[PDB]
Every structure is written in structure tokens, then in C-alpha cells.
Design a protein around this nucleic acid. Structure first.
Lengths: 46, 93, 241
RNA sequence: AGGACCGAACCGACUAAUGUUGAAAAAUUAGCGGAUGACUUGUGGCUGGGGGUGAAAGGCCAAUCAAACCGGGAGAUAGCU
RNA sequence: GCUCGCCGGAAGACCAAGGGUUCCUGUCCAACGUUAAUCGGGGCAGGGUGAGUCGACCCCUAAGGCGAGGCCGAAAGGCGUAGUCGAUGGGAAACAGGUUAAUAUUCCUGUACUUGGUGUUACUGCGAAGGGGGGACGGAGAAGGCUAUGUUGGCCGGGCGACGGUUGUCCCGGUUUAAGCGUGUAGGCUGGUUUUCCAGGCAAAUCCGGAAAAUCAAGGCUGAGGCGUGAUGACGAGGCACUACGGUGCUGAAGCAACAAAUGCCCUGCUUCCAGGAAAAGCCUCUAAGCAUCAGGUAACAUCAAAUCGUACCCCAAACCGACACAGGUGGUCAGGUAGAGAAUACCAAGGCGCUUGAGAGAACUCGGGUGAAGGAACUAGGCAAAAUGGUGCCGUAACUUCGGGAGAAGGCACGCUGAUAUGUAGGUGAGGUCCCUCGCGGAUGGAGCUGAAAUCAGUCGAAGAUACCAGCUGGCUGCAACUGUUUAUUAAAAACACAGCACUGUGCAAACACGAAAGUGGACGUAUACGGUGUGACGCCUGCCCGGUGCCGGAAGGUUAAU
């Protein structure tokens, strides 16, 4: 049976890309808190 | 465009290998590892004004770095560009 | 003209087809095709606001003029076309000056006929002129409530309005619903009556007809008038009976 | 032409069996319907939770739903273990 | 190195998403491989991806997103103009063979092709964020030709068969060759040439369209394929000389005709059809301000450039998603032979594999099957499971019915090989020549070689002749439902759902209703034969009486009634 997870770079970068996240103020706060925590990779490394 | 410092710095060094030797003995082609950008015009000018040899056509390609993980420590190689230079007239090393 | 298909098999066993041979066959006038195709019946937010709608076969939109601002320029009707957007059929009018446009085809209008607008146009079906010069007691179609728009009333198949009297600057019209309304006389009017009136004869044959016409199936879950305007009461005389 | 029949690819598994700490947190064996359209599918977007969507099961919304996940109110309260 | 077996419309090969070096070489066996692991998709070191002709990229675009101004909302926040992003499509160009352990249409020999700049030759009306020409579009059907492809004849070079015959109507391998150039056929499309004028194409326009006339009815457009060049070339078995046994140099002849044929093309075409089936850019005309010896454009000439990014590896699996080297899922293309209606089924060509624990023992018991004398659902809640027919063509086929169906109803008839009709029948495919002939991508012609269906008789083999796989059991009564279909992914696939039709009710356009605090949006770029809500659910006979009460309509002498 087809699994729930279907990898797609375009979908991933369009739904959780850096620019897409920064576009909305909520994503800006998410990025700020992730930086405060100290995550090695904020959203994704292309 | 010259600016000969750019021509001097564009190319890093020649590459030695069995394929390189076969190319040299077959078509007198030289394989050179060059800088990241290493544009075709820049490498052409550098070869012309550094080796004093005419170049017929220049071909370039990017070689991806390998991985040499040492155990819980992933180490990726750097990125460098390989360029093929054909002279067709220069019988030099 | 209606043809009863034989009961070869269920699903179009009892279909009724409304066919009309004189209608033109082939591609429409391409220069008059634009956007506003099937929108899916979804608002800007994308919520389901008009339930039981969706899908539907692709249909292009043809721009149709109703203002009829072209006055004093007789035009010749070349062919008749079926517009998927609207039940009523349209006709391709070519003006003497070279303008090709589409106008709703009345019942009395056939291929190869002359139509002229303006206040000096002859009183025959297919012409358009202000209702101020329209004799009382003549049926009308594609009536305009306010000048500048063109035919905001009686655009569906087999729709007519009977003029009862003028009674001053305004004019009293009787809508097909059976209500008397007062409309400004300066509005433009179109003589004649709309063409084919066999819309109800067709029974759509089977589910696929409505399914590809853009109507989704209705799922099961009275005498209360919801009219609340309080602005057009003076304009309207009485409601329908 | 036939929302036609017989019947491949393809489409949800209906039927008896296997497995019930399986190869698989739903698959296989042998029959079963459609297979030119109310058909199916790839590629992008849209509908975001007291809402969405739903040919209506109160189905699905990340292997979960008669109200998903995350951090907080909150070490909620508990005449119960 | 050989034998046996499986797939071979895949378990083969090539691409995009997928992972990002697992690909090749030398080296090691701690763990990793469900077992030992010299081997490997395990570790170490080195090498590997060559682009104007692939694609991405890139000018302008659909659905959709952002949004200068502006509107709305206490602020975050919502919609939206111009504008800008956004393919899943639209726009320019390459092939034969070889090459390395790993890369190619990227490198090598050639034919070539698209675009821009630079200067020259001779000529001249050039210049749009604008119009037009086509770009530019749906379902189904088909006939006629060609192509890859496969078969046969000759031909090329080697053979006389481990064993009964095999110098012949016998076997072995081949009989392959691109893009471009001129021919422009088969087929399809269109009626053309010249002049005058015009309320239109946002002002204007030689351009489009319309109105007038004179003339021809032969002119133009599109268009697979084949033909000579391409190509006295590439390939060529098999041989002639040098070998580190891995290999290198040279040679080399046939390489032609007929048949069948595609899902490929002619065809973005022709017929019918209602469900009426997008946009812009790619090329050209003209005009606006301007320039009107200028600057630009026209055909050619010599030259320059066409940056950047992946080019390995699997891509129906050991490498992607399933925690695994997992009996699961993954789009597009290539689609051979035998018989057959086929891309199902049975065996083979090229190619990939025997699937990561083996050998013995040959007990009960468990799982899937082979046969079984007699009965044949009698066991079981239960024809559940199993068992039986299963196709072709001919005869024959009831009730009812909306006349379509029932129906393939039921029930019977023959199915192999050989000769004759007919050394291979009708059809098709079709070489040369007579006559003229624009005189060749011509015909009235006349037969060369081949598929050769289907039918009757005779002879013959066996119990069975569709003898393999594949392949409906048949009929009636009866309740339900218009039929087809849809959900309870993971207990109930229906007697539930809607379904085409019918009935009631509401809506007059700034319509009704919902999303929304609000702009605005869907309804609908629709206009009462239109759309929203509720009930039943084709078709035939009907929907009969009643307003106690609840909503609903029209509203009344009157009693009651807050805010103020």
C-alpha cells in the first residue's frame, strides 16, 4: 500500500522553506525561537 | 578584462591520473583543477596568457566531494572544478 | 424540435433531446473567448457556500453585449450559436461598418436578417430602442431596469414581459413571475421575444448530464418569505401571486 | 453513441483460506465488479480543528478523531488506586 | 568453462521525482550479510560525470501566491489595481561507429543546423506596453499509404555431420546504414488577381474587416513517405601478422527484391455529437512622438560569441516510502518469434536471475495440491469451500416487455494430419512491356513471386481432435431497489447513500443564502424555462377527508405591550 510519506523537495521547500516561513510573522517568531534554542538546521538544508 | 591577477588566481593546479595521461597522449588534453567559479572565458584567457599556447575548446565540470566519516564524525570534502583544455598545437608537458 | 430516444438501455432510456438543426456547427468566433470559465463554485476564502455544485465540463465564455449603444448602424445576422453559459441561444450580427458581435436570438429572428437599433428603428421583433417609444400592449424581452446596462430582465429561455400602461415618466411592467413593477422609461428595450422555449422538455437523460453540467449530487439532511429590502418598495407595485 | 455486454493494464477489497508475538502495525492464494467514463492517474495550488471536507459513515484531517499535534495556564482537580 | 531451470508488455533496458557518490580500481574481515564471508550496496586510499545541438536555466503565460497606491478592521490582520512570481504545457538547433575499469548525442572522422554582435557590398521608410494572420486546444469512428519491426528468395564465406541419410527444394551468421540538402508525390485545406471608397479595429493606419466594381475559374497553403547527394564513407562475419593472453595493426564480399504490419506518422486532418471543449509569448504588416543625406531595415560577404547548472550509480528496487538487503506501493518510453482475437495465457530471441543458512530423517500433526470403487449436500445454521461446462461456426431458443431486452435462454450439430476440387481456390499484394505522354514522384494495359481465409468428398491415427494454459454451471419461484455507481481505510459494501424524473416553497439583481466584526467573494461576469431550501425517487392507476395545536400566508373592530 502507498505510504503516507512521499518525499518531494519542491513540496518541502514550498511548505516549510526559509522564505515561506519568513513571509508570515508567525514563521518569523518560530525562526527566532529556534535560533534562541540553538538548532543546527533551522528549517532545511538544500 | 585583464586584470592578470584574476587569470593567475583562477586555476589551482593540474590533475594527474590514468585518464588524464590517456587524454594527454591521445588528444593532447590537459586536465586542471581550478577555482570555484572558473568561468570558461577566464580559464581560456589564463591559459593563453600563462602557457603561451592556443586553446581550441575548453570543457569544464564540477566534481562533488566525497565523505570520509571517521566514526560519529562525518567529514565531507570540499568542492572543486575540473577543466579540460585542448591545444592541438602545443607539444608541451 | 424534440426527439425521444428509444429505450435501448437504462441511463438515457427515457432521455429527451432538444436538437435544432439550424444552429451553427463548428468552433465559435475565437477573438471573443476569454476567462471566467468554470470556477468550481468556491468563494475567495474557498468555503462551500453554494452547496451541491462543483466539477462540470470545461466551457469557454463568450462576451455578449446588451447596451446596444450602436444606433443607426444596421447589421446582418449570419449564424446562430448555442452558448453553454446561458440557455438562450445567441446570433452573430455583423454591422455595416464591420463589427461582429453576439446578441440573444429571438424566436422571430432567423439567419440572414437585418436588425437596427435607435429611436428611428422600425417596430419589428429583433430591434432595440428606448421603451418611451414602445407602444403599450406589446410583449418585450431582455428589458433594462436602469439605462446603460442592457437587458437585465427576461434573459432566460422563453421569458416575456407584457406592458400594461405607462402612467407618467415610469412604465409599469408585468414580470413572468406575475408581479407589477415600475421601471424608468429611459431604459433601452429590445423588441421581439427570446428564441427556443423548450428548456423544460429535455430531461437530461441520466445522472451524467447534470454531473458534467457542474451540479454535484444533493444530499438529504416553507412559505417563509425572506425578502427584506425596504429600498425598492416604491419601485415595485405588488409581489407575485 | 451506447454512464452496453465478454475481457487485459489499472481501480476499494466482496467471498473461503494463510498469517493473529506475519514478509506486511491490513499483504498473498483462488473466484468476484468496472474496465469510454458518475472512470483513473502524474504534476502545482486552494478549503486549517467548536473548523475543514464529506453521493452522509457523525467517515478522513500524517499508522489516532463522538473534536489532531505542539509550548503554556498546569505539579488542572480528584470524597478513587 | 559447461550442464539444468525462471522472467523475458519482465524478475529486461532507458528517463523525471526519489538517496546524494553506494559507480570503477588496489587493499582488510572486528561489526555489518538473519549462517563461515577471501566476496559485497561493510572500512581504508585513488579515479570517474567534458554541452549553442540533452534537459534545466531563460522572454512572456493557466490554476494559484505576493502586492506599490486604495478599502476595511482597536493593533497583529483580510481582499485587491498596475505590477510581479508561479508548469503540470506553449519558444532555436546532432547523428553513424569507436573510445576508458567507471563518462557521451559531451571526446574523436564527417555531413550539418538555430540565434546575437562586429565591419563591408547595393537598395530603402524605420520606429509600439496596439490591431490582425495562426499560434489556440473537447468525446467517439473509420478507411488509403508509408515507417520501425518480423518472414521468405537470391547472394556472400564455412560445413558433409560422434548414430540410420544428408553436394542439396540441406544447415550455419549477415543481407545494417542517421540529421541536412533538391525533388513536394499520396492526402488535406482554400476560390483567386486588379482598382475605388468606408460611422469599425480606443486617435490614425498601404495591415484586418466591410461596400462597389473589371478579370480568371486555375492560383496558393499544408503535407507523411520514397527518390540521388549524404555515403568511392561508417559497420561487416571470417581471415592475414605481432601477444604481458588483457590485447593491437591490416584485409574484407554479398550487403539486393517480395510479403504482413503496427498503439508511430500523414491527421492540431474528415463525419457525427452535445457536455460547445483557455491565456500569452515564438514570426510579419501598419501606423503614435521621433528621425525623414542621419539613425535603422533588406539579401549576401569575413569574423566573434551562445554564460551557468546534473551528466556515475537502482529507478516496478538490496540504493525511493514502508524502523530491515521487507512476499507491499511507485509515473513515461522501447513492445521481437512460434499458434492465437489481443499488451491475458504456453515455450523461446537479446538481456537479467536460481532470490543469503545447507545436508540428512522420510513419523504423528499443520499448510497447498494429485487420484479415489458406491452414493452426491444426505455433514454443516448455510452449495461456504470445492467439483463440473467453459471457444469457434450452423440449426434452434418459451413467459413477459416500456418492443430495447429476456438470450450466449434452454437444447443439438463438426472441430487432428494428408490428397483432390485448387502441384495454393476467391480476395489482397502486385515486376516488365504495347500508345501516347507535361515526357516522369503518369496513366486503358498484364502477368512475374507470396499470405492465402472458408467449404464438400475421400484416406488415415487414437478412448478422448478447443485434446496444453486460458476459458460462463443451467432454469424457475420469491421480497427488496428505476438501472450504473458511492461510504463504514482497520467488525456490517447492503434492504444505507445519492441517482435521472416529480412536488412544495423562497429569490426582482446591489436578488435570496454562506464565508466573514468588515472591505470583498461564490451564487453569476447568470437574470423567474434562471438560482437557493425541503420531501419522494423511472414508468402505469391515484395522492381521498380534517386547521384541534405548532410553524406559514393574507391581517382585523378590538384587549395587552418596553424603549421614549
Amino acid at each position: 500500500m502507498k505510504r503516507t510519506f512521499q518525499p518531494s523537495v519542491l513540496k518541502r521547500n514550498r511548505s516549510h522553506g526559509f522564505r515561506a516561513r519568513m513571509a508570515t510573522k508567525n514563521g518569523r517568531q518560530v525562526l527566532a525561537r529556534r535560533r534562541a534554542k540553538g538548532r543546527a538546521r533551522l528549517t532545511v538544508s538544500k | 578584462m585583464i586584470r592578470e591577477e584574476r587569470l593567475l588566481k583562477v586555476l589551482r593546479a593540474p590533475h594527474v591520473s590514468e585518464k588524464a595521461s590517456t587524454a594527454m597522449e591521445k588528444s593532447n588534453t590537459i586536465v586542471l583543477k581550478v577555482a570555484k567559479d572558473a568561468t570558461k572565458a577566464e580559464i581560456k584567457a589564463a591559459v593563453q596568457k600563462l602557457f603561451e599556447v592556443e586553446v581550441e575548446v575548453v570543457n569544464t565540470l564540477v566534481v562533488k566531494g566525497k565523505v570520509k566519516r571517521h566514526g560519529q564524525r562525518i567529514g565531507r570534502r570540499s568542492d572543486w572544478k575540473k577543466a579540460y583544455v585542448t591545444l592541438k598545437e602545443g607539444q608541451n608537458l | 424540435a424534440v426527439v425521444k430516444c428509444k429505450p435501448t438501455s437504462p441511463g438515457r432510456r427515457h432521455v429527451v433531446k432538444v436538437v435544432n438543426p439550424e444552429l451553427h456547427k463548428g468552433k465559435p468566433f475565437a477573438p471573443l473567448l476569454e476567462k471566467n470559465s468554470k470556477s468550481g463554485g468556491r468563494n475567495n476564502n474557498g468555503r462551500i457556500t453554494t452547496r451541491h455544485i462543483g466539477g462540470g465540463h470545461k466551457q469557454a465564455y463568450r462576451i455578449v453585449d446588451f447596451k446596444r449603444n450602436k444606433d443607426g448602424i444596421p447589421a446582418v445576422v449570419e449564424r446562430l450559436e448555442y452558448d453553454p453559459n446561458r440557455s438562450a441561444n445567441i446570433a452573430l450580427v455583423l454591422y455595416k461598418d464591420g463589427e461582429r458581435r453576439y446578441i440573444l436570438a429571438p424566436k422571430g429572428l432567423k439567419a440572414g436578417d437585418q436588425i437596427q437599433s435607435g429611436v428611428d428603428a422600425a417596430i419589428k421583433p429583433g430591434n432595440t430602442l428606448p421603451m418611451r417609444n414602445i407602444p403599450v400592449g406589446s410583449t418585450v424581452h431582455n428589458v433594462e431596469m436602469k439605462p446603460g446596462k442592457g437587458g437585465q430582465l427576461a434573459r432566460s429561455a422563453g421569458t416575456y414581459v407584457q406592458i400594461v400602461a405607462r402612467d407618467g415618466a415610469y412604465v409599469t411592467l408585468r414580470l413572468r413571475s406575475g408581479e407589477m413593477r415600475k421601471v424608468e422609461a429611459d431604459c433601452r428595450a429590445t423588441l421581439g421575444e427570446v428564441g427556443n422555449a423548450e428548456h423544460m422538455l429535455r430531461v437530461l437523460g441520466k445522472a451524467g448530464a447534470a454531473r458534467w453540467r457542474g451540479v454535484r449530487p444533493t444530499v438529504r439532511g416553507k412559505g417563509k418569505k425572506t425578502r427584506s429590502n425596504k429600498r425598492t418598495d416604491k419601485f415595485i407595485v405588488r409581489r407575485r401571486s
